[PDB]
Short mmCIF file of C-alpha atoms and ligand atoms in Angstrom, two decimals:
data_model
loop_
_atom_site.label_atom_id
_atom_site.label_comp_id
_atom_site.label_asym_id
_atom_site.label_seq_id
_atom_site.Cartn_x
_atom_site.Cartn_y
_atom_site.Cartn_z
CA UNK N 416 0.00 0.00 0.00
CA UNK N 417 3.06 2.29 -0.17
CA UNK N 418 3.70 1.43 -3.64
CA UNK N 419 6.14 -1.30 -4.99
CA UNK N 420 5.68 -4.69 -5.57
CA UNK N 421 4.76 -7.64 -3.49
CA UNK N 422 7.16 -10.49 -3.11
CA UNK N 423 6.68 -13.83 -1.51
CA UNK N 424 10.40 -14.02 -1.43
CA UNK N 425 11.69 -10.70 -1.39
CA UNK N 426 15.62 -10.05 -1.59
CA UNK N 427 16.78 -11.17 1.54
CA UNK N 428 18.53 -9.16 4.12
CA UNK N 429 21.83 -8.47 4.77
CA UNK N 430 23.31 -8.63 8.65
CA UNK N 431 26.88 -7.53 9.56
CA UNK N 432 28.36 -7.04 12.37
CA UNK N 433 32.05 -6.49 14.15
CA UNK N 434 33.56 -9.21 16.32
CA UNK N 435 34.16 -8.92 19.54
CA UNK N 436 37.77 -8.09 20.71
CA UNK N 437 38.55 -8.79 24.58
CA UNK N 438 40.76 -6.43 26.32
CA UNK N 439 43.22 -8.28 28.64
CA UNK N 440 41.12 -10.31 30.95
CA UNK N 441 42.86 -11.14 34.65
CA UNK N 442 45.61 -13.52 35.39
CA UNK N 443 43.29 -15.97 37.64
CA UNK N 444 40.56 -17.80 36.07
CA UNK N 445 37.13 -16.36 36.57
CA UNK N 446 33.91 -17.92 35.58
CA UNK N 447 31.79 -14.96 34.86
CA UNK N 448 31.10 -13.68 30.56
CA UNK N 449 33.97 -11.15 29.80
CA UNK N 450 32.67 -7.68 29.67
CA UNK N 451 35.54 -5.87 28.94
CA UNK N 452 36.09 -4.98 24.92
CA UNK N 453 38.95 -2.91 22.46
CA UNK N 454 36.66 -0.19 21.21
CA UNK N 455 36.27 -0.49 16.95
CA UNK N 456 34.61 0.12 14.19
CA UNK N 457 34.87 -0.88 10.77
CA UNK N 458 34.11 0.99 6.64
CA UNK N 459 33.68 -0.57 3.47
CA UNK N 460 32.52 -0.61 0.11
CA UNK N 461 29.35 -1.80 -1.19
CA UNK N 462 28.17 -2.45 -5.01
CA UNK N 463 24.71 -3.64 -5.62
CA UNK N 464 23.40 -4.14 -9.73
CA UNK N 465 20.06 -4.80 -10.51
CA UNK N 466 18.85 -5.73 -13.82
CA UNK N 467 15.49 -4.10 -14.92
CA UNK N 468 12.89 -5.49 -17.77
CA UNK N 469 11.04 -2.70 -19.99
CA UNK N 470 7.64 -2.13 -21.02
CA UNK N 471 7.91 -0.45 -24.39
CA UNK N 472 4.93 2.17 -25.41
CA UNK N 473 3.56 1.65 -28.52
CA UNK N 474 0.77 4.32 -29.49
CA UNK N 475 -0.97 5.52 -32.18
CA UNK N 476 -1.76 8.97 -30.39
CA UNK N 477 -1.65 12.16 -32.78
CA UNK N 478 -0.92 15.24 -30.15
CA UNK N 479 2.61 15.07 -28.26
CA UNK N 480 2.61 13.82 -24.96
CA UNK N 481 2.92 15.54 -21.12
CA UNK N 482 6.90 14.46 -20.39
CA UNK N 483 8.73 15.38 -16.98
CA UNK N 484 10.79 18.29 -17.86
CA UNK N 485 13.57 20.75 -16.22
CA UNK N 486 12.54 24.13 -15.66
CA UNK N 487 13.89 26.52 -18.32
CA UNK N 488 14.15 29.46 -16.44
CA UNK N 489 17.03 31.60 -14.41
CA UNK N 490 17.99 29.89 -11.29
CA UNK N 491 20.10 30.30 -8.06
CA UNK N 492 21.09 26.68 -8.23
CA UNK N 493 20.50 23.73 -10.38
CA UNK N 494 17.87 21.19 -9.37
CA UNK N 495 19.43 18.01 -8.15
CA UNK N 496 22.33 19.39 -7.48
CA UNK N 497 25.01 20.47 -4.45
CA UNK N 498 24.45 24.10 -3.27
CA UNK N 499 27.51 26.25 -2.75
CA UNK N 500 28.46 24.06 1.04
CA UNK N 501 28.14 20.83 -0.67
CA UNK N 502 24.56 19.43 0.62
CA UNK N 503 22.65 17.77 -2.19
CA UNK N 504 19.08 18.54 -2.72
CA UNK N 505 16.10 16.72 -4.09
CA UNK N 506 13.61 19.65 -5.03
CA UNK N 507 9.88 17.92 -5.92
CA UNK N 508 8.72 14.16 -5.91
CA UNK N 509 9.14 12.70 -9.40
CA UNK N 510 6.54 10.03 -10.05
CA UNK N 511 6.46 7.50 -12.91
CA UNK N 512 3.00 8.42 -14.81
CA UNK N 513 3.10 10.69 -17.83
CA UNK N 514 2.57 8.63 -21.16
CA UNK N 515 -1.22 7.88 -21.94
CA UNK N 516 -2.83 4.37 -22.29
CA UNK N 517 -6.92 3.79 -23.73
CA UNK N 518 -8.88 2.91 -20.89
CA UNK G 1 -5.08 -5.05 -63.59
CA UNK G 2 -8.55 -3.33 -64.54
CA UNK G 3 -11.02 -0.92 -64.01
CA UNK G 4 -11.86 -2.85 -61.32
CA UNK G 5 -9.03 -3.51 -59.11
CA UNK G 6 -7.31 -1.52 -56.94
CA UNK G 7 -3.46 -0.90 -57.58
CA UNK G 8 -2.48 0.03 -54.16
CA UNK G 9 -3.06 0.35 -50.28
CA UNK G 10 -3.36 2.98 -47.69
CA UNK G 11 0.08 2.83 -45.85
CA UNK G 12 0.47 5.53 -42.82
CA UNK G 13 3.00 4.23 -39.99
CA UNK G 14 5.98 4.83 -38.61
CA UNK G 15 8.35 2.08 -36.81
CA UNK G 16 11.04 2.16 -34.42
CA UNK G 17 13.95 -0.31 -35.00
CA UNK G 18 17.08 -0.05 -32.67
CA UNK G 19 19.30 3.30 -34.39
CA UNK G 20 16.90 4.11 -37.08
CA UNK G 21 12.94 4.80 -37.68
CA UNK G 22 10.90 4.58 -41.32
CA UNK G 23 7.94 6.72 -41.98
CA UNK G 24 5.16 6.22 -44.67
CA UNK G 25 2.27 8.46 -45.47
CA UNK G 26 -0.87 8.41 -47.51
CA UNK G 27 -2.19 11.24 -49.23
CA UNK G 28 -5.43 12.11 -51.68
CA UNK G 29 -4.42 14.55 -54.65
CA UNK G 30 -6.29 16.58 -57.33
CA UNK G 31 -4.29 17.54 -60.48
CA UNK G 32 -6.12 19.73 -63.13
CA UNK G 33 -4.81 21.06 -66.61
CA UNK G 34 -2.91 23.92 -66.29
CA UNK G 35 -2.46 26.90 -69.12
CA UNK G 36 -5.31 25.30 -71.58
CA UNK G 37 -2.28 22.38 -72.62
CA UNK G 38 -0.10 25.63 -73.01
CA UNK G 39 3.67 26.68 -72.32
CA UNK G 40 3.74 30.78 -72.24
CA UNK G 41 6.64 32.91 -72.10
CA UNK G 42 5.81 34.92 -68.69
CA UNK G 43 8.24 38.20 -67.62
CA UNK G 44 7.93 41.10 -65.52
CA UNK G 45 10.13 44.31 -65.74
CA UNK G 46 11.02 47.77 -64.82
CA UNK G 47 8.35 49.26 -67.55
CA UNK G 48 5.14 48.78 -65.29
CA UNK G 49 5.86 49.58 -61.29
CA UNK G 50 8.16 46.87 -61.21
CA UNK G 51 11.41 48.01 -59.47
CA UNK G 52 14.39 46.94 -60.92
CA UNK G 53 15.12 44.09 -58.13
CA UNK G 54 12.04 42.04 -58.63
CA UNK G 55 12.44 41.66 -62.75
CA UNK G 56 12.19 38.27 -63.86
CA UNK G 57 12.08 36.17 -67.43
CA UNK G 58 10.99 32.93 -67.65
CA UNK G 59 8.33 29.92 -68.44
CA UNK G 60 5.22 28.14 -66.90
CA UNK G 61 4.28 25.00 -68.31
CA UNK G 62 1.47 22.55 -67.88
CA UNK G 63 3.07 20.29 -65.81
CA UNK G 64 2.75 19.56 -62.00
CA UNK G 65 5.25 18.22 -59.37
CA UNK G 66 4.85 16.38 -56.19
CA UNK G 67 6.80 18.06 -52.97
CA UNK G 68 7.18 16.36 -49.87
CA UNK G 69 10.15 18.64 -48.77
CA UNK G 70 8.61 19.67 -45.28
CA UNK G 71 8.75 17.62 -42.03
CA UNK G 72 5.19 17.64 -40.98
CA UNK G 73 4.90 15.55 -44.08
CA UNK G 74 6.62 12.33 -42.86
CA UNK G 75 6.02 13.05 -38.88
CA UNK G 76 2.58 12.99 -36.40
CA UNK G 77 3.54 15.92 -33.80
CA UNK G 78 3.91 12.83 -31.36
CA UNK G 79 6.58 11.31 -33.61
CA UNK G 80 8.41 14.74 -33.78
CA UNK G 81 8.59 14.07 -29.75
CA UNK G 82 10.24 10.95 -29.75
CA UNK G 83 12.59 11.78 -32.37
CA UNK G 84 13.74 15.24 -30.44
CA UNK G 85 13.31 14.25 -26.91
CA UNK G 86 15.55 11.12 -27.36
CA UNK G 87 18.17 11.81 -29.91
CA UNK G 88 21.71 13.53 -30.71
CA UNK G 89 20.90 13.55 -34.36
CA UNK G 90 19.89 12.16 -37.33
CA UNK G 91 19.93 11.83 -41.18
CA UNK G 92 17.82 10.22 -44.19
CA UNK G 93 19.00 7.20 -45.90
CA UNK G 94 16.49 6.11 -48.65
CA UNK G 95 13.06 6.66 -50.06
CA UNK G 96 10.13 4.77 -52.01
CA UNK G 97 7.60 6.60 -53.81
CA UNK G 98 4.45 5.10 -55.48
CA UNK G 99 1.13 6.67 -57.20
CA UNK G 100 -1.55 4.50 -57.32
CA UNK G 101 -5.69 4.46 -58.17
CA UNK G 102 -5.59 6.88 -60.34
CA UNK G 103 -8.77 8.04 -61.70
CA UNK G 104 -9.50 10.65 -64.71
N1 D5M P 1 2.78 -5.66 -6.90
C1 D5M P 1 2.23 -6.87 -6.86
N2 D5M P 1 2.92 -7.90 -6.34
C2 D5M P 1 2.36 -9.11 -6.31
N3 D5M P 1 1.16 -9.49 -6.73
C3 D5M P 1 0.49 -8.45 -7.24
C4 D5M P 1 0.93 -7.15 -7.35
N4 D5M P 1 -0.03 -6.35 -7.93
C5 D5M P 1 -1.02 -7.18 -8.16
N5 D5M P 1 -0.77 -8.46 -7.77
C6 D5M P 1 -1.64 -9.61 -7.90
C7 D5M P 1 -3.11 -9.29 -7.69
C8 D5M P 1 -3.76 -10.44 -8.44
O1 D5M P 1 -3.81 -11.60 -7.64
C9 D5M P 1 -2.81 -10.65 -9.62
C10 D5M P 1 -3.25 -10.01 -10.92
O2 D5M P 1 -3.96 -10.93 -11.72
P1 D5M P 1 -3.82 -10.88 -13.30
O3 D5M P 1 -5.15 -10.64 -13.91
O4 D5M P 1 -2.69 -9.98 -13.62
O5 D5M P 1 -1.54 -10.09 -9.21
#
């Protein structure tokens, strides 16, 4: 109901996590869990590819279409875009329905 | 072929193949005789108000021609679209041509 499609098996998810690191425990045996860690963290690189299928149009409509355009006009910055400190923007909502079908 | 039998079709498309398109169109035309069968000398000069600049000499016959040379011709406004939203260029390769059904 917030859009998307259903999936009885959707893609499955992805855990990760750092291992634990004890600091130096003590020099006589003690039965209790070790609560005592080396402080870390960890960074990365992640690549994910996803192969899309197409629906192509084919219409026998006379008149041109309504397309999603860029405004043509003057403009302090450019629309998805980084301002002058470096934060990128996403202006409006873009949704997917501007070509025409017969009902 | 006779009088009753049609020589040709009504072809109006236009397909989309990978790097290249084809259009076809369809037309009605009326050609009557022109000049009474007659070629005439025609001219215009300097003698009536006829500025020196637009002076001419020359011919009409009674012939006609067929021009396709405009755009509109071969494109729906919605073709014009694709081909301008979605492209870097293009050029014309070939052309057929056919007059059919003719009628006097
Ligand atoms: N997004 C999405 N995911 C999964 N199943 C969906 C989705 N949208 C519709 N459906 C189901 C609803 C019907 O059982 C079927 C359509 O039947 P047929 O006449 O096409 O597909």
């Amino acid at each position: 109901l917030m859009g998307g499609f259903g999936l009885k098996h959707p893609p499955p998810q992805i855990l990760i996590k750092n291992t634990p690191v004890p600091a130096d425990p003590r020099s006589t045996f003690n039965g209790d869990k070790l609560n005592s860690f080396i402080t870390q963290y960890s960074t990365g690189q992640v690549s994910v590819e996803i192969e899309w299928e197409l629906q192509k149009e084919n219409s026998k409509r006379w008149n041109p279409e309504i397309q999603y355009t860029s405004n043509y006009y003057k403009s302090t910055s450019v629309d998805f875009a980084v301002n002058t400190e470096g934060v990128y923007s996403e202006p409006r909502p873009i949704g997917t329905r501007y070509l025409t079908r017969n009902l | 072929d006779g009088v009753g039998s049609s020589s040709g079709n009504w072809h109006c498309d236009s397909t989309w193949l990978g790097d290249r398109v084809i259009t076809t169109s369809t037309r009605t035309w009326a050609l009557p005789t022109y000049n009474n069968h007659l070629y005439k000398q025609i001219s215009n000069g300097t003698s009536g108000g006829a500025t020196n600049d637009n002076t001419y000499f020359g011919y009409s016959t009674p012939w006609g021609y067929f021009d396709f040379n405009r755009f509109h011709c071969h494109f729906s406004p919605r073709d014009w679209q694709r081909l301008i939203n979605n492209n870097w260029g293009f050029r014309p390769k070939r052309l057929s041509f056919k007059l059919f059904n003719i009628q006097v």
